[PDB]
DNA sequence: TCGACGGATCC
DNA sequence: GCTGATGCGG
DNA sequence: GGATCCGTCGACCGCATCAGC
């Protein structure tokens, strides 16, 4: 079935107006995504913070258009140490952060340009491109090690400041989170190991799944569709892109959106409204 | 994500 | 710059 | 022995690389 995202709720559970708009987008090729009008859609949407994953573009080759975004003037990028065209993430912000960090503090997990950490006044933002378990599950063993290291890192962070985590987490948590759960239990992104990892991450940090907390029983809400088989036009998709929040931020939560109609990638953008 | 292959089983 | 092959993705 | 039924498999889309000029 096809999905319409409900209207943006911009007031908190206590009616505070939203003060912060964060958009996350796994662009799957920054240069292509710009040619496909992605920055235009970003301008229409006008977020305070914009997080990009799977940029596949080293720092040298960053397009010029990115320096024409004055609402996102503070810009940070991470590319793999020695794998061109692969992975990559960016964080662009209206206001400068207090401090920015790359990686999670673990050598084996910090070589593929997957994590940027931006500390602001009242919270810390992490944007992440989690490793795919791979076709045939070649990297499932690796992914389990990452999941544990990432969880351990996020727990540390959330013990010092309220934490917002966004990006492609490369798992559909539950059967409601993808169109074809039955035929995907052995495929990357819906293995029990990946689902267990996600569950443990929600419990251990702890974090709440912003979208599922507001729409706990809403089916067919996905952030990714394979380019093949006309899957997007059939809404045969997976929810892979999340905003996970520290529980303290839940009364700051105004809404968590799926921007289903924005084209430019095999992921659509997600948007988070907080009253901070 | 399909649809095509089997091999398997049941009426 | 252009072809043709390969890596990677969920 | 004709149909139906499940695991298993291999190709499609798209972006960016690399090898070779």
Residue numbers in the entry: 43 to 318
Recite the paper's sentences.
Base excision repair (BER) is the pathway primarily tasked with repairing DNA base damage, with apurinic/apyrimidinic endonuclease (APE1) having both AP-endonuclease and 3′ to 5′ exonuclease (exo) DNA cleavage functions. Importantly, 3′-8-oxoG impairs the ligation step of BER and therefore must be removed by the exo activity of a surrogate enzyme to prevent double stranded breaks and cell death. APE1 end processing of 8-oxoG, during which the oxidative DNA lesion is removed, results in a ‘clean’ 1-nt gapped substrate suitable for DNA synthesis by Pol β during BER.
These substrates represent potentially unligatable, BER intermediates in which the repair polymerase, Pol β, has misinserted an 8-oxodGTP across from either a templating A or C. To obtain crystals of the substrate complexes, we employed a double-mutant catalytically dead variant of APE1 (E96Q/D210N). Specifically, DNA bending at the site of the nick results in an open intra-helical cavity in the DNA, and in both cases the 8-oxoG base is in an anti-conformation and positioned out of the protein active site into the open intra-helical cavity where it does not form any base-pairing interactions with the opposing A or C. This conformation allows the damage-containing 3′ end of the DNA nick and phosphate backbone to shift into the protein active site for cleavage. Of note, density for the 8-oxoG base is relatively weak, for the structure with 8-oxoG opposite C. We attempted, but were unable to obtain, crystals of APE1 with an analogous uncleavable (i.e. phosphothioate containing) substrate. Therefore, it is likely that the relatively weak density for the 8-oxoG base is the result of high mobility, as opposed to low occupancy. Supporting this, the B-factors for the 3′-8-oxoG, as well as the 5′-base and opposing base, are higher in the case of 8-oxoG opposite C. This high mobility in the DNA region around and including the 3′-8-oxoG base likely results from the lack of WC base paring between the 3′-8-oxoG base and the opposing base and the open active site pocket in which the 8-oxoG nucleobase resides. A similar phenomenon occurs with the N210 substitution, which coordinates OD1 of N68, thus resulting in ND2 coordinating the nucleophilic water molecule. Similar contacts occur between the APE1 protein side chains and the phosphate backbone of 3′-8-oxoG opposite C, Figure 4C. Specifically, the hydrogen bonding between R177 (NH2) and the 8-oxoG O6 oxygen atom is weaker, 3.0 versus 2.6 Å, in the case of the O8:C structure due to the contact between R177 and C requiring R177A to shift further towards the opposing strand than when it is opposite A.
